[model samples]
Target: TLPQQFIKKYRLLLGEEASDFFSALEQGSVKKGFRWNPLKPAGLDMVQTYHSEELQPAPYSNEGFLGTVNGKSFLHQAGYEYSQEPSAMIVGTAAAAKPGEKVLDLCAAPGGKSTQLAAQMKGKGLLVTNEIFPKRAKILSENIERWGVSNAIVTNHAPAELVPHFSGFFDRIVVDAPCSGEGMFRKDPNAIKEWTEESPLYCQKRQQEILSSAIKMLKNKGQLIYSTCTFAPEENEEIISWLVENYPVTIEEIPLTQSVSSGRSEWGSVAGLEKTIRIWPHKDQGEGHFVAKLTFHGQNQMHKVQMTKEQEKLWTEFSNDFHYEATGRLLVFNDHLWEVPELAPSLDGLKVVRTGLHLGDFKKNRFEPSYALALATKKIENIPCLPITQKEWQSYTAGETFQRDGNQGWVLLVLDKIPVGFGKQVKGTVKNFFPKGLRF
Candidate 1:
């Protein structure tokens, strides 16, 4: 049901690839894909040991797999993996994140990239995850909780607000900019049916404005990845081209493998084509995406601020509650609690967008820590993970007696570290290891 004009435009883009694909668009329920949580385990054997020992993966993606159980079942029930588009996962991997790195996810919301960055940090250093909308920020916080990302700081502020506080601050910054979402035609029928000629141009303008601010926030010699879900050249290549012509940034040919790489050739020459990676669903397993990795050789243009007593009190309270095992310094800045990154020469003197949670000061000079950071801490280690069949699962939930160690500790219901769920040993009994208020 594509308009004639849209069909013609699409044909030009796809070229003998067919206008047939448009007419077949369906309004089916949203399908979900799960990305393996690197925080849980690594490799095929580790994935198998963590979830289902017999479920072997394709070995194409570091932790990609076809599951024995529905992927959503694991995502919602176990909270072991992130339910995200396969193409969306590419940005995080392309950024080349590692533990103890200072990572920033600009325009983060309902946070897919931020969580991935945190997982890469592996409860080390700091992850500053920012979102503009307050409502989306809450959802982003919840996602961080669900994934157990203790290494991040979540904040709500438009890009304009960040300019004076923390510019040139991140070693790796992800600008997963908002766009028209043209590549979502397969999942969203309206994208094809309601298509208009003016759409791509409008999207490109907004993308350029956002990328300008994002580049300003990046550190010199630091990696900045600009990404979008839309496919039109105006939004894809054009935005990157605009940045390159206007800024002193250079685009590096992103080295990638087939399982996670995208093609820049199809993008042709409307914009910054050479420096970007663009994925088309016609080219991959999930919805399409466009990504470009760049580094700023420009001068640092950032402002620094100090933390307040109230902010420090709350941050300290949380650290104390977790027994102060955190590696970074805790401070209060801009009325929010911030955790400075550990010794990272590459990211020194950069302002952070968000830390993780906001802990408030109490009346008696006491500090109440943010529960968000508490759950993300890595101190609660050596958790046990025992497997169970339907019968055992039911029995354990029903308060059945089972052998457990006398020492209280973390336990994992895993096949080997592929990750199932978390529990703790209590009173020498395998008592119902339930999270508060969570019923089967």
Candidate 2:
């Protein structure tokens, strides 16, 4: 049963037609949304063909395709995955991050937005994706690596904890704040079960706190995209209004599609709230979502990071075997070599989950290549490379050793000529080096 307060409140705000439409929508299923990987070899034309023929294009984004899939084997080969239309649209088109500009996803987890942001930046800039929870941060790290994002750092830190080091650094920031999940009622029934009249009030307080810290990290005139998956006025327009009233920020108009609508100004009594974008499930195929774009006007002060000298021998040893060069700040932590983000700020007093690209750790006197190094490398020389088919790739990814006659040394494992991981060739058998936790 719908809460009495929920019906009564929306009835007054949306009127009878729209309120009744949304009420019926809550009882139905939501459309599934997917995005094509621009980095995939199939390219954009093939992706467009697939979308036009097999699936409908999501109204909010050109990159998004809407459909239900019976099997996701194509996801591995086609390089497309399932996401909510609003979620894909929120990050891909709306974030507007450019290449070589430093970016941050303040509450990134499960890595949908972070990965999309990485693709937008084209692996050129420093993209730091921070998640407060350790477990979710691990998942985000895994997905980032799997997506072959070379210029990203996955950190596990609270929104406030990051303010000291990253203040006024990022050119673009995304705060996909946690909210009441009212938009997720049809997708996850628990959202309905957990609803209360006070839920939005509780979430609004948290959203404001996150937005405050996020603003501090954005550079002067930097764009910040604040979004939520709830329909609550308090969490949506009201929070945007709160930021504008409290901080030196201005609301920016989000160019939205016809299916999406503008934020309600009277709902929050904020004059510029109408510039924010709203996605109502009743109107669009996507689940409900709210996005507000803002530009910070505060003067930003920049800080430089200290670059530690790389061990020349260690660099030669690894580069000789893998035939790759480190592009960023090379630092050693507990004998593990990492090529961190170029110009990355000082992270001296923070708990870092995963620093930039983890090259590998040195053991005894030999250099062992990391999985990150393999995923980042486009071509491999000075090593025997074994190109495996999709079937064999599945076996290799499953941690199964395969017999192959090759020179006794490191071997680059490839699927469709894309490096998947590393394998050390011993005599006639290639030993799998894929992480156990990452195996299918």
Candidate 3:
């Protein structure tokens, strides 16, 4: 139950002078919403094709479709688009990645955008995905793999560590900056419970610093999309506003004739800002989120790289092993400068990442290849499909083995062709990965 005062304050902020936009915000959260997965080949048409009165476009972000699943029947069994916040998915759609452009997600964790970006790329081009946190990095890597994205590289590094290695190299750079949770009001009540005056302001400062660092890595004429899940004008509008005043960058107009809210009114003139999209619950039938796209002006200079003996050796072996080709179009680098053979630029645009390999010389020096390149392939040598029902998902997790049909060794668990988990066949029982301590 929400406090009446809080509801009134929200209504005021929603521009009650308008119609009942305020009431819609409170209503949408309790209902369900859907977002299209860019990783799937036919995602857009597929989603539009899902016809039902209960389902319609959520007036939020692009690529964000709203709908309801029969929680009693579908959630546990149906393998649909990845469940995510509508606003976050909007940030990815704002990226507008084409079929073969190289892109980077500097802080991709639990990789919602990375998966979405891969869908936009159609699994082509080099999509270097990284998460600074170790535990989350593993999760990001797995999601990329599950989506069958072969052209991606995943790395783990902080702002300071990554900046030096790939300066001005990426054509598209996205910094989905971590911030205070104001925008998550519709999704998680606990998020607001932890907010403090000092906390949001602190988050703003840190986000400013991170964006400043990421801006330096953008290629000349390249684009940068900065997003936040918080609604504080201080955090979203103010941060972008500061960049416009301080940096050699310009705000890009996000075309939103098809979106929920056209833009944010609060931070109107941060840095000659226009064409930015800001979604709020009161306006869009989705969670609140903020997004801004900026383009760095061009300068005539090459990004430099440094190399070591070990890097040279790794580069030599793997380059030859894969019969490597490079695309002169992308600025490929490590601490040492390296390039793929010209014919190989198509390979570069992928998001299958392994540390050390994403950077460094692949064609210039020595290289024992890491398993990353080979592992990106969608097909594994010997995994079979093992499907389960909603009740089976519950029972199997309780250390129970479910019935199977003619499966042996390791089986790939799937639902509507979506990989759910793993199961092992021993004698007659099928052992599942959903074993104990998962459900609350």
lDDT of 3 by residue, 1-440 (tens): 33344445545655553235445434555435555554443445444454343466654445555664443232222223555565677777788877777788988998888877877886567788889888888878766654556567687777656666667777898889988876665567787676665665899889988887787778888899998887666777778878887777888887655655544545545544446666666656456677889989955244433344665555545454344433332233454333332323233333324422232224433332222222222333233446666566556545577887664655555433434445666776787554233322
Q: Single out the weakest 10-residue window by summed lDDT for candidate 1.
A: 23-32
TM-score of each: 0.73, 0.89, 0.65
The residue ranges of model 2 lying beyond 4 angstroms of the native Cα positions read 39-53, 67-88, 256-259, 300-315, 379-384
Give lDDT tens digits, candidate 1, residues 1-440: 55577667778877776443453333322334455665544433443554566553422235555443343343333445665666677777677677776777888987878876776777676677788888888788777766767567677777766656667777778888877777677767677665678888888888887777777777778778888887777777777767777888877667666544444545554344655676655445556788888877897776544555664555555445335544555555544454545442333334434454333223355453333333333333443345545454445444454565574443444432334344445676555543333444
Worst 10 residues of 2 by lDDT: 70-79
Query: How does model 1 score by TM-score?
Result: 0.73
Candidate 3: regions farther than 4 A off: 1-31, 34-64, 68-80, 262-272, 298-440
By lDDT, who's the top model here? 2
lDDT for each of the candidates? 0.60, 0.75, 0.60
Off by over 4 Å in 1: 19-32, 41-61, 66-78, 190-194, 259-275, 304-324, 330-354, 357-440
Clashes of each: 22, 0, 38
Tens digit per residue, CA lDDT, model 2, 1-440: 66677777677778866665566565656767766565544435544444356566767665676764323342433234435454446645788778899999999887878877877887688999999999999888877776667788788998998888998988999999999987777777788888898999999999988988888898889999998888889899889888888888889977656546779888775678888888777665577788888899997655523222345575686577556767888777877777887767777887777788888777776567888767656444445578777676777778898888866677778665456678887888889887787676
TM-score quality measure for candidate 2: 0.89
The lDDT of model 3 is 0.60
